[PDB]
Design an enzyme around this catalytic site. Structure first.
Site, PDB file in Angstrom:
ATOM      1  N   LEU A   1       0.834  -1.207   0.000  1.00 44.43           N
ATOM      2  CA  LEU A   1       0.000   0.000   0.000  1.00 44.43           C
ATOM      3  C   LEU A   1       0.868   1.256   0.000  1.00 44.43           C
ATOM      4  O   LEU A   1       0.529   2.241  -0.657  1.00 44.43           O
ATOM      5  CB  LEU A   1      -0.955   0.020   1.209  1.00 44.43           C
ATOM      6  CG  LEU A   1      -2.136  -0.946   1.168  1.00 44.43           C
ATOM      7  CD1 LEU A   1      -2.773  -1.083   2.533  1.00 44.43           C
ATOM      8  CD2 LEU A   1      -3.175  -0.516   0.148  1.00 44.43           C
ATOM      9  N   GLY A   2       1.974   1.192   0.733  1.00 48.65           N
ATOM     10  CA  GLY A   2       2.942   2.272   0.867  1.00 48.65           C
ATOM     11  C   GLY A   2       3.926   2.031   1.991  1.00 48.65           C
ATOM     12  O   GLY A   2       3.909   0.971   2.626  1.00 48.65           O
ATOM     13  N   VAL A   3       4.790   3.021   2.243  1.00 47.84           N
ATOM     14  CA  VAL A   3       5.797   2.962   3.300  1.00 47.84           C
ATOM     15  C   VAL A   3       5.710   4.221   4.179  1.00 47.84           C
ATOM     16  O   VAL A   3       5.813   5.344   3.677  1.00 47.84           O
ATOM     17  CB  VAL A   3       7.232   2.642   2.766  1.00 47.84           C
ATOM     18  CG1 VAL A   3       7.692   3.626   1.688  1.00 47.84           C
ATOM     19  CG2 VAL A   3       8.254   2.538   3.897  1.00 47.84           C
ATOM     20  N   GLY A   4       5.468   4.008   5.470  1.00 47.87           N
ATOM     21  CA  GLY A   4       5.360   5.079   6.454  1.00 47.87           C
ATOM     22  C   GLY A   4       6.701   5.473   7.039  1.00 47.87           C
ATOM     23  O   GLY A   4       7.750   5.087   6.510  1.00 47.87           O
TER      24      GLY A   4
ATOM     25  N   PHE B   1       7.930   4.506   9.918  1.00 51.60           N
ATOM     26  CA  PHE B   1       8.489   3.282  10.491  1.00 51.60           C
ATOM     27  C   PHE B   1       7.760   2.087   9.875  1.00 51.60           C
ATOM     28  O   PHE B   1       6.540   1.963  10.018  1.00 51.60           O
ATOM     29  CB  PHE B   1       8.376   3.276  12.033  1.00 51.60           C
ATOM     30  CG  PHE B   1       8.682   4.593  12.709  1.00 51.60           C
ATOM     31  CD1 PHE B   1       9.996   5.004  12.908  1.00 51.60           C
ATOM     32  CD2 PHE B   1       7.657   5.428  13.137  1.00 51.60           C
ATOM     33  CE1 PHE B   1      10.277   6.231  13.517  1.00 51.60           C
ATOM     34  CE2 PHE B   1       7.939   6.653  13.750  1.00 51.60           C
ATOM     35  CZ  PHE B   1       9.247   7.046  13.935  1.00 51.60           C
TER      36      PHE B   1
ATOM     37  N   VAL C   1       3.572  -0.854   4.869  1.00 46.19           N
ATOM     38  CA  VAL C   1       2.241  -1.428   4.962  1.00 46.19           C
ATOM     39  C   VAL C   1       1.940  -2.255   3.732  1.00 46.19           C
ATOM     40  O   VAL C   1       2.046  -1.768   2.616  1.00 46.19           O
ATOM     41  CB  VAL C   1       1.173  -0.339   5.020  1.00 46.19           C
ATOM     42  CG1 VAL C   1      -0.196  -0.972   5.152  1.00 46.19           C
ATOM     43  CG2 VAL C   1       1.448   0.618   6.164  1.00 46.19           C
TER      44      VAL C   1
ATOM     45  N   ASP D   1       0.868  14.761  12.910  1.00 41.54           N
ATOM     46  CA  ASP D   1       1.081  14.692  11.460  1.00 41.54           C
ATOM     47  C   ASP D   1      -0.230  14.620  10.642  1.00 41.54           C
ATOM     48  O   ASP D   1      -0.391  13.730   9.802  1.00 41.54           O
ATOM     49  CB  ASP D   1       2.039  13.532  11.121  1.00 41.54           C
ATOM     50  CG  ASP D   1       2.839  13.698   9.841  1.00 41.54           C
ATOM     51  OD1 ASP D   1       3.368  14.810   9.606  1.00 41.54           O
ATOM     52  OD2 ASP D   1       3.003  12.696   9.112  1.00 41.54           O
TER      53      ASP D   1
HETATM   54  C1  LIG Z   1      11.625  -0.039   5.914  1.00 41.53           C
HETATM   55  C2  LIG Z   1      11.697  -1.402   6.217  1.00 41.53           C
HETATM   56  C3  LIG Z   1      10.663  -1.954   6.982  1.00 41.53           C
HETATM   57  C4  LIG Z   1      10.676  -3.309   7.323  1.00 41.53           C
HETATM   58  C5  LIG Z   1      11.716  -4.131   6.872  1.00 41.53           C
HETATM   59  O1  LIG Z   1      11.764  -5.456   7.207  1.00 41.53           O
HETATM   60  C6  LIG Z   1      10.815  -6.248   6.624  1.00 41.53           C
HETATM   61  N1  LIG Z   1      10.562  -6.342   5.322  1.00 41.53           N
HETATM   62  C7  LIG Z   1       9.601  -7.256   5.180  1.00 41.53           C
HETATM   63  N2  LIG Z   1       8.965  -7.721   4.081  1.00 41.53           N
HETATM   64  C8  LIG Z   1       8.013  -8.679   4.167  1.00 41.53           C
HETATM   65  C9  LIG Z   1       7.360  -9.107   3.003  1.00 41.53           C
HETATM   66  C10 LIG Z   1       7.356 -10.460   2.634  1.00 41.53           C
HETATM   67  C11 LIG Z   1       6.685 -10.881   1.485  1.00 41.53           C
HETATM   68  C12 LIG Z   1       6.047  -9.948   0.655  1.00 41.53           C
HETATM   69  C13 LIG Z   1       5.393 -10.388  -0.504  1.00 41.53           C
HETATM   70  C14 LIG Z   1       6.125 -11.054  -1.499  1.00 41.53           C
HETATM   71  C15 LIG Z   1       5.493 -11.521  -2.656  1.00 41.53           C
HETATM   72  C16 LIG Z   1       4.120 -11.339  -2.839  1.00 41.53           C
HETATM   73  C17 LIG Z   1       3.374 -10.688  -1.854  1.00 41.53           C
HETATM   74  C18 LIG Z   1       4.007 -10.226  -0.696  1.00 41.53           C
HETATM   75  O2  LIG Z   1       3.298  -9.583   0.273  1.00 41.53           O
HETATM   76  C19 LIG Z   1       6.081  -8.588   1.000  1.00 41.53           C
HETATM   77  C20 LIG Z   1       6.720  -8.173   2.175  1.00 41.53           C
HETATM   78  C21 LIG Z   1       7.685  -9.176   5.442  1.00 41.53           C
HETATM   79 CL1  LIG Z   1       6.476 -10.402   5.708  1.00 41.53          CL
HETATM   80  C22 LIG Z   1       8.381  -8.691   6.547  1.00 41.53           C
HETATM   81  C23 LIG Z   1       9.304  -7.735   6.400  1.00 41.53           C
HETATM   82  N3  LIG Z   1      10.072  -7.119   7.294  1.00 41.53           N
HETATM   83  C24 LIG Z   1      12.760  -3.582   6.120  1.00 41.53           C
HETATM   84  C25 LIG Z   1      12.757  -2.225   5.779  1.00 41.53           C
HETATM   85  C26 LIG Z   1      13.823  -1.744   5.019  1.00 41.53           C
HETATM   86  O3  LIG Z   1      13.728  -1.680   3.773  1.00 41.53           O
HETATM   87  O4  LIG Z   1      14.879  -1.387   5.585  1.00 41.53           O
END
Ligand SMILES: Cc1ccc(Oc2nc3nc(-c4ccc(-c5ccccc5O)cc4)c(Cl)cc3[nH]2)cc1C(=O)O
Ligand SMILES: OC[C@H]1O[C@@H]2O[C@H]3[C@H](O)[C@@H](O)[C@@H](O[C@H]4[C@H](O)[C@@H](O)[C@@H](O[C@H]5[C@H](O)[C@@H](O)[C@@H](O[C@H]6[C@H](O)[C@@H](O)[C@@H](O[C@H]7[C@H](O)[C@@H](O)[C@@H](O[C@H]8[C@H](O)[C@@H](O)[C@@H](O[C@H]1[C@H](O)[C@H]2O)O[C@@H]8CO)O[C@@H]7CO)O[C@@H]6CO)O[C@@H]5CO)O[C@@H]4CO)O[C@@H]3CO
Ligand SMILES: Nc1ncnc2c1ncn2[C@@H]1O[C@H](COP(=O)(O)O)[C@@H](O)[C@H]1O
Ligand SMILES: Nc1ncnc2c1ncn2[C@@H]1O[C@H](COP(=O)(O)O)[C@@H](O)[C@H]1O
Lengths: 295, 443, 193
Positions: free
Chosen positions: B14-17, B19, B22, B131
């Site tokens: 959806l986006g990135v806040g 912290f 989302v 905010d």
């Molecule tokens: C700003 C930030 C926030 C959180 C972060 O750590 C995480 N990234 C993550 N991504 C995921 C994630 C895993 C799978 C998917 C995904 C992959 C394929 C299809 C659909 C999906 O939702 C999207 C996000 C999850 Cl579950 C936990 C996470 N925890 C890392 C950062 C960062 O870029 O430094």
């Protein structure tokens, strides 16, 4: 079940009576008594509790009754200055005049009303046990106003719609009063002798014209006219003449519910009663009504 | 077989806040959609936001408003925190102002009534969403305002002013851009005024290329008033966007306004069901009153669910006591009150905040140090102007604590403030005895 | 109606339904796989691909478990996260899970990362005064009809702040607003110097 007035109290705590935002004044026993009465006028509060720096706890309660007590004892004449009033401190006069009488906010309303009747006082302060500081100064006017708020939802019994002649509420005999020519010094003497909050100003024929209460005494300190108590009670009440909607008087053939409704609307403590034509008749005060509500 | 949590399959972002990010949450079994905010525990621990994240979770669970993003569940894993919350299909308000242009006076009013209802709900629970912007404000399929991103929100502490400043130069009150001390509600009203201008006009009232000239426009408080908007709505925008925080409009001022009163629904500002409004609890003090009268605390916990039986009767009685304004509170501008005292004959005396000084701030610090060393004082220097003095009473044997802070009125004017810190003797009286002992010694 | 809504929230008792673990890795490799001690290193679990990040959720039980990633046919561990040396040779990344509850977890997280009762002078601009303190509730005048001892509702910031009036005489006047039990009380003090 038969007594619904008693159920309003006991179940409800003292905290509910305390307003959301209030003004409270505290005097340190080390300051002059003359400056303390002049301080009650500037702040507009009727009574204020006393604090002792050496004991580090509240000892007494300063009321207008103390200002009445000082004058009878110490007033000499209009020519001779009351050297005692100016020199005397709050602690020095406290040693001459006669435990702390107070209530808890967590404590019941039934225990608070009983404290005012038993100790024979009009102003009772409420102090928090966990905090240790004063919160509010409870009055008979505030308790009945709080009752009129909650009693509206409850159905009133047979004794609540009873006439003054049938009921036994109010001291019918030996009523103390003053006349239009009666001086302030003579009037103040009755406040210490008979020990009553209000004194009705009655004409020589027997007609009630004015009422001199304990609050009307503060005008002598407000105008700095305390040095002349030789003048009549009419001259002492000449300040309210422009802004006064007459004296409050009810009849013997009036129901108890109408009498209670009259006191809350007028915001007065003592209510004068007369029959047929204005005449001397027993005075009914809030202390009589609240005592009847308990038993 | 994609990424799943708790019967929920994660999808598109959806986006990135401020912290974390989302990510769209889709149910596998039903098809229900949620917004899953993923807060990386390591990135939260790398900074001092660990305290701010804890309060944000507690506040979102405490809230129960139809115009605030409802938090369903906080799923905790050893690597990162997951926040399952309410999803809104309509998207951000900022995109709607760009696509549909300026919203019609009546339609923009309805959206402003809903957004202010949520801001008012936050202020009641002592939380200030610092905010506020159309980017943080979201809409659904049925077009209804929903406030999100509570990562910049802070608690309203008694006798405390929050100087922290939000990043967005726009939507921020003149005191925020100047970096001066303020109380929470005033900023939220200024942030609402600029939002009210946003959906009504289409553009921002204070906008510029470079930061210095933008700050000059906000401090000046001069904004363009278009010809299309009526005289009634124009007076509200002027009262809402004021330079002075005391001259500015309040939550009570907007509710009393003629333009805001029209089209206002009944469910927006309730008075009687305000006690049950907060999800989180019956009053903690309130529970004890029921515990000290009949049963031990934690009693009838099943009973509360059961409804068999008691505490609700006490809470309903509090609403009746809060209903009558004349008995519990005084009104400031009729027949005179009998207990009113006549004025004293010798001018009315005027109260003032603490003690004032005209000398150098370095000299006042040396003056307060030598006065404190004369008595038996023990403190802890937090800041070059902030002090936390503590003095033990000899009669009672209890510790008394109070705060000291130095401010400046004018260019050559300085002020010293005394604040009371809550822990036989009276706490309110002991603070006064501690104050008097320092004022008498100093000059 | 409102009571019913409040009641529903009350009925719920806090708990966590499922206890999973994140297991993520960021790379530019097309084929990603992970093997640990949970499956006894028999099978390679496939990583779902975020456009940049790669992540695969697996419900692992509480305890110390060592896992290793395999990108484009090469078993390489993650540097950024803690690792432990195995009996075989290679040092694989260690994942240790004990508690996954938000309130408790935060505190443990909270625990990670001036002087009590020590009076001392400090060496080496003051903040601007807020105008909300300048307005005094005791300076404000109320209606002639209402009670004199009654005051209007004060701002939250103002209370606990000491307000004093200049002394005409030896006697000193100072007052402050305090809140008890969600009740507000403005106590005044008269005491001579
Ligand atoms: C700003 C930030 C926030 C959180 C972060 O750590 C995480 N990234 C993550 N991504 C995921 C994630 C895993 C799978 C998917 C995904 C992959 C394929 C299809 C659909 C999906 O939702 C999207 C996000 C999850 Cl579950 C936990 C996470 N925890 C890392 C950062 C960062 O870029 O430094
Ligand atoms: O297959 C299981 C294994 O998978 C992963 O390991 C891979 C690793 O990540 C890659 O980098 C690469 O490793 C290469 C490595 O760099 C080379 O050194 C070589 O290793 C050889 C040694 O150099 C040589 O000395 C000898 O090793 C001896 C061991 O030291 C000795 O312990 C024993 O081996 C047995 C162990 O004693 C016993 O505990 C048990 O070990 C198992 C682990 O406990 C278990 O976790 C798992 O290990 C994973 C690993 O975590 C992943 O990262 O399986 C282990 C094996 O069952 O069993 C051991 C069986 O050998 O004896 C040997 C000598 O006989 O020989 C080894 C090679 O056999 O190996 C790689 C060469 O490219 O690939 C590995 C693939 O495993
Ligand atoms: N003017 C008065 N003269 C004599 N008694 C009174 C008068 N006013 C009230 N009382 C009685 O004295 C008691 C206390 O009165 P008060 O001080 O007004 O509460 C009550 O029981 C009244 O009945
Ligand atoms: N019955 C009454 N009629 C008119 N005024 C009254 C009456 N009783 C008290 N007052 C006035 O009300 C004020 C406060 O009364 P009290 O509560 O009795 O001290 C005083 O100024 C009295 O003059």
């Amino acid at each position: 079940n038969n007594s619904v007035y008693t159920s309003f109290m006991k179940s409800h705590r003292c905290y509910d009576l305390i307003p959301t935002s209030s003004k409270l004044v505290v005097f340190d026993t080390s300051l002059q008594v003359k400056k303390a009465f002049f301080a009650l006028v500037t702040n507009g509060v009727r009574a204020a509790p006393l604090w002792d720096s050496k004991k580090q706890s509240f000892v007494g309660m300063l009321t207008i009754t103390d200002f009445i007590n000082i004058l009878h004892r110490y007033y000499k004449s209009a020519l001779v200055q009351i050297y005692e009033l100016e020199e005397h401190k709050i602690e020095t006069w406290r040693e001459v005049y006669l435990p702390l009488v107070c209530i808890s906010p967590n404590a019941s309303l039934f225990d608070a009303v009983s404290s005012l009747i038993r100790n024979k006082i009009h102003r009772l302060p409420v102090i928090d046990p966990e905090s240790g500081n004063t919160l509010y100064i409870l009055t008979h006017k505030r308790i009945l106003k709080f009752l009129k708020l909650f009693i509206t939802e409850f159905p009133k019994p047979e004794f609540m719609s009873k006439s003054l002649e049938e009921l036994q509420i109010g001291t019918y005999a030996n009523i103390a009063m003053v006349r239009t020519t009666t001086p302030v010094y003579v009037a103040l003497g009755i406040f210490v002798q008979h020990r009553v909050s209000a004194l009705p100003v009655v004409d020589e024929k027997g007609r009630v014209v004015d009422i001199y209460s304990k609050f009307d005494v503060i005008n002598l300190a407000a105008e700095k006219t305390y040095n002349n108590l030789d003048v009549s009670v009419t001259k002492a009440l000449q300040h309210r003449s422009h802004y006064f909607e007459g004296v409050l008087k009810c009849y013997l053939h009036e129901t108890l519910e109408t009498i209670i409704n009259r006191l809350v609307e007028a915001e007065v403590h003592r209510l004068v009663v007369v029959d047929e034509n204005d005449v001397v008749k027993g005075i009914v005060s809030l202390s009589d009504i609240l005592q009847a509500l308990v038993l | 077989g994609r990424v799943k949590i708790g019967h929920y399959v994660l999808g598109d972002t959806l986006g990135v806040g401020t912290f974390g990010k989302v990510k769209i949450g889709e149910h596998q079994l039903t098809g229900h959609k949620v917004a899953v905010k993923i807060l990386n525990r390591q990135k939260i621990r790398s900074l001092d936001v660990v305290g701010k994240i804890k309060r944000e979770i507690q506040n979102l669970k405490l809230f129960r408003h139809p115009h605030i993003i409802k938090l369903y569940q906080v799923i905790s894993t050893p690597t990162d925190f997951f926040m399952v919350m309410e999803y809104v299909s309509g998207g951000e308000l900022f995109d709607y102002i760009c696509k549909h242009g300026r919203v019609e006076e009546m339609e923009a009013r309805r959206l402003f009534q809903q957004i202010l209802s949520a801001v008012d709900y936050c202020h009641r629970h002592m939380v200030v969403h610092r905010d506020l912007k159309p980017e943080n404000v979201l809409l659904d399929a049925h077009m209804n305002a929903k406030i999100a991103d509570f990562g910049l929100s802070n608690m309203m502490s008694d006798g405390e002013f929050l100087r922290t400043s939000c990043g967005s130069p726009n939507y921020a009150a003149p005191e925020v851009i100047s970096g001066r001390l303020y109380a929470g509600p005033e900023v939220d009203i200024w942030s609402c005024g600029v939002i009210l201008y946003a959906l009504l006009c289409g553009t921002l009232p204070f906008d510029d290329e470079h930061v210095p000239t933008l700050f000059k426009k906000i401090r000046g408080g001069v904004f363009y008033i278009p010809e299309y908007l009526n005289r009634s709505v124009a007076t509200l925008l002027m009262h809402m966007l004021q330079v002075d925080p005391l001259k500015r409009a309040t939550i009570k001022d907007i509710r009393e306004h003629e333009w805001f009163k029209q089209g206002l629904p009944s469910y927006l500002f309730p008075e009687d069901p305000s006690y049950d409004a907060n999800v989180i609890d019956d009053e903690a003090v309130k529970e004890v009153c029921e515990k000290f009268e009949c049963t031990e605390s934690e009693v009838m916990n099943s009973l509360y669910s059961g409804d068999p039986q008691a505490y609700h009767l006490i809470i309903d009685n509090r609403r009746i006591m809060n209903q009558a304004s004349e008995f519990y509170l005084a009104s400031s501008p009729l027949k005179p009150h009998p207990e009113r005292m006549p004025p004293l004959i010798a001018k009315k005396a005027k109260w003032h905040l603490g003690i004032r000084s005209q000398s150098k701030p370095y000299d006042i610090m040396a003056e307060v140090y030598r006065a404190m060393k004369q008595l038996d004082f023990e403190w802890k220097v937090v800041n070059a102007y902030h002090l936390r003095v503590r003095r033990k009473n000899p009669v009672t044997g209890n510790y008394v604590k109070m705060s000291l802070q130095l401010y400046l009125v004018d260019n050559r004017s300085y002020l010293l403030d005394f604040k009371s810190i809550d822990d036989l003797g009276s706490h309110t009286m002991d603070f006064f005895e501690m104050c008097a002992s320092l004022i008498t010694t100093l000059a | 109606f409102v009571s019913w809504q409040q009641d529903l929230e009350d009925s719920v008792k806090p708990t966590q339904q499922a206890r999973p673990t994140v297991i993520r890795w960021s790379e530019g490799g097309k084929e990603v796989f992970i093997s640990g001690s949970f499956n006894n290193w028999s099978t390679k679990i496939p990583l779902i691909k975020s456009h940049n990040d790669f992540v695969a959720i697996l419900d692992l039980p509480e305890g110390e478990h060592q896992y290793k990633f395999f990108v484009d046919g090469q078993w390489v561990h993650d540097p950024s996260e803690p690792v432990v040396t195995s009996q075989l040779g290679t040092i694989n990344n260690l994942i240790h899970v004990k508690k996954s509850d938000f309130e408790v977890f935060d505190a443990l997280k909270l625990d990670s990362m001036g002087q009590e009762m020590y009076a001392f002078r400090s060496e080496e601009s003051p903040p601007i005064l807020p105008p909300h303190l300048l307005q005094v509730i005791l300076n404000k005048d109320t209606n002639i009809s209402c009670d004199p001892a009654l005051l209007p509702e004060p701002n939250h910031v103002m209370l606990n702040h000491l307000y004093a009036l200049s002394i005409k005489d030896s006697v000193m006047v100072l007052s402050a607003t305090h809140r008890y039990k969600k009740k507000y009380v403005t106590t005044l003090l008269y005491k001579p110097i």
